[PDB]
Design a protein around this ligand. Structure first.
Ligand SMILES: NC(=O)C1=CN([C@@H]2O[C@H](COP(=O)(O)OP(=O)(O)OC[C@H]3O[C@@H](n4cnc5c(N)ncnc54)[C@H](O)[C@@H]3O)[C@@H](O)[C@H]2O)C=CC1
Ligand SMILES: Cc1cc2nc3c(=O)[nH]c(=O)nc-3n(C[C@H](O)[C@H](O)[C@H](O)COP(=O)(O)O)c2cc1C
Ligand code: SF4
Ligand code: SF4
Ligand code: SF4
Ligand code: FES
Ligand code: FES
Ligand SMILES: [K+]
Lengths: 213, 263, 44, 430
């Protein structure tokens, strides 16, 4: 939660971080997306790549992203402390992100936050002692009509009841990976009692096309 | 000449294209209040103290950054300009600490002076303030970061004039801290000039710390001798004893900087 | 057969942590040569 | 036309909005996408810009600037620099989840919109700044872009038109302020997502220093449908200066929270009770509606009975249309807790650059957190109003405005509930 760094023995510029060679080819493909002379534009993907290889960002991932992009290290420290995904502390293997803004608080995300707390025995910000679950409390994840919902590491688990998130946590402890979807009856975002629109078949190519084209 | 005609408080003035609203007000002898604008730093526009009313325009514009258009009547003393100045000053003083007696910048503080000039005379802030961890950027620059107004003159100086690229902003929002993010020591050869441009006592001179106070100082204009540049300086004394060395502006020598040895 | 009962977007149930970056690595061969500012960086 | 709404399924742009069809290329070409794209590209930039100006399309990002007028800022000769279309796929607005549905379910429509729009503005490439939280949607979109390259639809000689055009996807990293177009530009350039000042507008100095148009996913994806179906088809929906169709996200205290494509000037009550099943507990259980996502002022039940869901009728209802994200709030809602949580969102999502937002949004969150408990006095309500009027208009981007407007709507429509909250705090703690 702090925004200054102190050298712990496990987080220092002598902490071993280095990319794998397939990640070096991924970094080459990232840097080829930007114009020649604006290599600094590859700070945000490559550093996020360092969060996918490692799980979190020590201050050797930041210095390595600084070194291989020829940017000053402060310009990577700013990006790492500005954007909320970059874990500058080690998180659990499953990083549970409960949305508690108004479209999800109105549909009782408080009960699900309480359910994850009384299930894992932890509270917001704490990591479980087996380092498998980190529970924090995030802002709008952009799945508002599927409220209430959580995010685990790539995935949105939507339309949740406390029993549904208890069951998702139960099968995350068992090793399997669940399906990122609404745990109610619907599929993505449709009205829950059947389609109020888009019931007719789509027309296809040529429909309604104006003359002179 | 491609000079266009603009109006400052109704007075006509001919300006080069690309002139900011602040420079158009400066040509008629009027100084707009500012905290992040510095005439030798790049334009940031992130303090909003320079917001001035252009008439027949329902929005104050940042005069430090906005180029003039042809025929704008800049209203430096209108009512919504003064309300903009008072509101921005109130936000600057909301989380600012009550350190004016224990602050070295007192008596020479831009935040004090244009709080007296352009802001309200009391507080509506009925909450608790922030407190920021102090940083250690050297044995020259004392750092008290609760007094920082996040104007980024630090960062623009260290990036553009000192060529250091080690000062920066970490975090987001009200927790945005100016620092180096690590235990790193900002020792350039020009690292003392961040004491000059910081409009608050967030960065102060550690040798000059607590010793004098600017209203009792005699300002003797003199010359540097530490190098062959001949940098124009102010030796400020108090009761017959040299207290500090500030820069003078000379456009052709030391523009308004001095080295750390001179300082 | 017109189907409006099943959710056809089932591919994202098998995306791993490197799906986006390996897709970018695959697409790197299809792309036009980048423009050049004329220098290596604005600090050059 | 006088009454609006009841849009037909043949008049839909976002067919396969619900994921019920194949989102890949063989499904998309079977739904009208990528049809005669080469004939759109070959007719020049002026014809496409005229079809977008004819359609009356306004900015679906939420501000509603005229899209043809905005894209005609790029119809200017080359000054050596390349030109860039940049798709704003951030969508950080609470209430708003429509661009997630476009990217996840109609991705080839977005890719064809990138091609047609960048042809109109003479652009070289498309940087789709997608939200970092939308990972599955980003890989979904990358699969569609691979299908578009392998079919020769984009890239070298795009659709056989002799026009070179790339489509890139840049992922965000968790900042709502990176949906603001200049802060999104600064985020693509590898820096902190802090908004630039305007002018220079991004058409003059944009991404990397280039001429650049940032446009929303919806206002880009509906552009091949405007080019195929004609601009007059798109202008034949909604009121005048309120043309077209619109995605709506009705969430909160409705029976069936959903995304729906609907005609532009539809009534709010008809939209809620027709596509969402109405407010929970009946329409008499309605307390308030935030009409267009968090940044717009809320409107109470006595405005929601008659209001139309376009830009102009919501401006006349002293709110805004925004992202057309309808957050419905019933009578059981502590509305001060919801608005104070929304202000807490705006201080957590605020990049700290300029003074009035950085200081005053945290100060409004502290005042709103005391207003939830009632730990205040009524003279602090008007004071809070003044604080919002010092943040609104004086900031660099419109997140200060978007933080000021929920406070102003809550005060303007529920000052007595704040005053009774504070007086009952006073009489139960003294
Ligand atoms: N979709 C989402 O997730 C979110 C949407 N919003 C919406 O964003 C809106 C604010 O957006 P802004 O871009 O700040 O507002 P607006 O003042 O700036 O401008 C809208 C667009 O018009 C263009 N434009 C306007 N005047 C121009 C000129 N003179 N020259 C060139 N281009 C010009 C701008 O480049 C911009 O793209 C809010 O009203 C809100 O509804 C806010 C938050 C999240
Ligand atoms: C704080 C803030 C966040 C914004 N976020 C988004 C966003 O996530 N997506 C979006 O399309 N527009 C967003 N906008 C609106 C943009 O500034 C811009 O108007 C829009 O993205 C592109 O213009 P258009 O509406 O014509 O498409 C945001 C504006 C502000 C002030
Ligand atoms: S910086 Fe200025 S306003 Fe702040 S404590 Fe020092 S003298 Fe006072
Ligand atoms: S320490 Fe001073 S110069 Fe640096 S950003 Fe803060 S107020 Fe500005
Ligand atoms: S008002 Fe807030 S969101 Fe905008 S530039 Fe300033 S800190 Fe950023
Ligand atoms: S409010 Fe929770 S996802 Fe948008
Ligand atoms: S002086 Fe223009 S905003 Fe700081
Ligand atoms: K100082």
């Amino acid at each position: 939660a702090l925004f200054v760094h102190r050298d712990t023995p496990k987080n220092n510029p002598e902490t071993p971080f280095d990319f794998t060679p397939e990640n070096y080819k991924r970094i080459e493909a990232i840097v080829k997306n930007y114009p020649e002379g604006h290599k600094a534009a590859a700070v945000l993907p490559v550093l996020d790549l360092a969060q996918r290889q490692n799980g979190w960002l020590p201050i050797s991932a930041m210095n390595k992203v600084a070194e291989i992009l020829q940017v000053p290290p402060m310009r990577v420290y700013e990006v790492a402390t500005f954007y909320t995904m970059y874990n500058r502390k080690p998180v659990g293997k499953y990083h549970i992100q409960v949305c508690t803004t108004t479209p999800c608080m109105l549909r009782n995300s408080d009960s699900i936050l309480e359910a994850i707390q009384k299930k894992l025995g932890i509270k917001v910000g704490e990591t479980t002692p087996d380092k498998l679950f980190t529970l924090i409390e995030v802002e709008c994840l952009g799945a508002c009509v599927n409220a209430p919902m959580v995010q685990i590491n790539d995935n949105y688990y939507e339309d949740l009841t406390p029993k549904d998130i208890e069951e998702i946590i139960d099968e995350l402890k068992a090793g399997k990976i669940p399906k990122p979807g609404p745990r109610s009856g619907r599929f993505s975002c449709e009205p829950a009692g059947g389609l109020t629109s888009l019931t007719e078949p789509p027309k296809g190519p040529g429909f309604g096309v104006q003359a002179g084209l | 000449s491609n000079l266009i005609e603009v109006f400052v408080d109704g007075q006509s003035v001919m300006v080069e294209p690309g002139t900011t609203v602040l420079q158009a007000c400066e040509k008629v002898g009027m100084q707009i209040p500012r905290f992040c604008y510095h005439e030798r730093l790049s334009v940031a526009g992130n303090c909003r103290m320079c917001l001035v009313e252009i008439e027949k325009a329902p929005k104050v514009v940042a005069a430090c950054a906005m180029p003039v258009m042809k025929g704008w009547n800049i209203l430096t003393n209108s009512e919504k300009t003064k309300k903009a100045r008072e509101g921005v000053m109130e936000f600057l003083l909301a989380n600012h600490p009550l350190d004016c007696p224990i602050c070295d910048q007192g008596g020479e503080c831009d935040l004090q002076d244009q709080s007296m000039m352009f802001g309200s005379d009391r507080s509506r802030f009925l909450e608790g303030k922030r407190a920021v961890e102090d940083k250690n950027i050297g044995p020259l620059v004392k750092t008290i970061m609760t007094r920082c107004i996040q104007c980024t003159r630090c960062i623009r100086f260290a990036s553009e004039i000192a060529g250091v690229d080690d000062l920066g902003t970490t975090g987001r929002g009200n927790d945005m801290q100016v620092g180096t993010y690590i235990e790193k020591m900002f020792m350039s050869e020009l690292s003392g000039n961040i004491i000059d441009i910081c409009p608050v006592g967030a960065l102060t001179s550690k040798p000059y710390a607590f010793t004098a106070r600017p209203w009792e100082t005699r300002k003797t204009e003199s010359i540097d001798v530490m190098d062959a540049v001949g940098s124009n300086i102010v030796v400020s004394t108090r009761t017959g004893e040299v207290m500090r060395i500030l820069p003078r502006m000379h456009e052709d020598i030391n523009e308004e900087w001095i080295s750390d040895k001179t300082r | 057969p017109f189907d409006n009962t099943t959710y056809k977007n089932l591919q994202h149930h098998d995306y791993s942590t490197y799906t986006f970056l390996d897709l970018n690595l695959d697409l790197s061969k299809f792309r036009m040569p980048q423009p050049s500012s004329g220098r290596e960086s604005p600090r050059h | 036309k006088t009454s609006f709404g009841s849009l037909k399924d043949e008049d839909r742009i976002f067919t396969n909005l619900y994921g019920r069809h194949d989102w890949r290329l063989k499904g998309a070409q079977s739904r009208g996408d990528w049809y005669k794209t080469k004939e759109i590209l070959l007719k020049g930039p002026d014809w496409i810009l005229g079809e977008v100006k004819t359609s009356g399309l306004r900015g679906r990002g939420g501000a509603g600037f005229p899209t043809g007028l905005k894209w005609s800022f790029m119809n200017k000769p080359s000054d050596g620099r390349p030109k860039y279309l940049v798709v704003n796929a951030d969508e950080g607005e609470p209430g708003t989840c429509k661009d997630r549905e476009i990217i996840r379910h109609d991705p080839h429509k977005l890719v064809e919109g990138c091609l047609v729009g960048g042809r109109a503005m003479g652009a070289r490439a498309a940087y789709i700044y997608i939200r970092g939280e939308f990972y599955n949607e980003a890989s979904n979109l990358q699969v569609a872009i691979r299908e578009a390259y392998e079919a020769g639809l984009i890239g070298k000689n795009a659709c056989g038109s002799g026009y070179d055009f790339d489509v890139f996807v840049v992922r965000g990293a968790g900042a709502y302020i990176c949906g603001e177009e200049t802060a999104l530009i600064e985020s693509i350039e590898g820096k902190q997502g802090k908004p630039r000042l305007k002018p220079p507008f991004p058409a003059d100095v944009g991404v990397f220093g280039c001429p650049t148009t940032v446009a929303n996913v919806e206002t880009v994806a509906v552009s091949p449908t405007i080019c195929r179906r004609g601009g007059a088809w798109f202008a034949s929906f909604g009121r005048e200066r309120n043309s077209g169709t619109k995605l709506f996200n009705i969430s909160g205290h409705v029976n069936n929270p959903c995304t729906v494509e609907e005609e532009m000037s539809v009534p709010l009550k008809e939209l809620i009770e027709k596509h969402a099943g109405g407010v929970t507990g009946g329409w008499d259980n309605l307390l308030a509606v935030i009409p267009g996502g968090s940044s717009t002022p809320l409107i109470p039940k006595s405005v929601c009975e008659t209001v139309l869901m376009d830009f102009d009728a919501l401006i006349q209802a002293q709110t805004g249309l925004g992202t057309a994200a309808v957050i419905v709030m019933d009578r059981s809602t502590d509305i001060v807790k919801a608005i104070a949580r929304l202000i807490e969102f705006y201080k957590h999502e605020s990049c700290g650059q300029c003074t009035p937002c950085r200081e005053g949004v945290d100060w409004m969150n502290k005042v709103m957190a005391r207003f939830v408990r009632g730990d205040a006095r009524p003279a602090e309500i008007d004071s809070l109003w003044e604080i919002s009027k010092q943040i609104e208009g004086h900031t660099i981007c419109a997140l200060g405005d978007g933080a000021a407007w929920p406070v102003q709507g809550l005060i303007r429509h529920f000052r007595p509930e704040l005053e009774e909250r504070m007086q009952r705090f006073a009489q139960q703690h003294q």
